[PDB]
Amino acid sequence: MNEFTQISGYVNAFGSQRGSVLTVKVENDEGWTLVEEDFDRADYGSDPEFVAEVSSYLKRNGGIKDLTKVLTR
């Protein structure tokens, strides 16, 4: 059981690693579920890549804010 929750600051973004593979869900301002994309963390390696890879694709679908407010630069 892997549930989706708003990605930290992203007003309408969801990200949960469905098992060993990753599942992304993006909503609209009206909260309409737009996109559900799948990733795999096995290719990446670690937890940060898990979140950081999700944000990359999802942002252009309506994900705008921050997942880890620590200024990753």
Partner: peptide, 10 residues
């Protein structure tokens, strides 16, 4: 798996 959305907000 144990990570999920919980990893994002951290």
């Amino acid at each position: 798996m144990k990570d999920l959305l919980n990893l994002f907000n951290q």
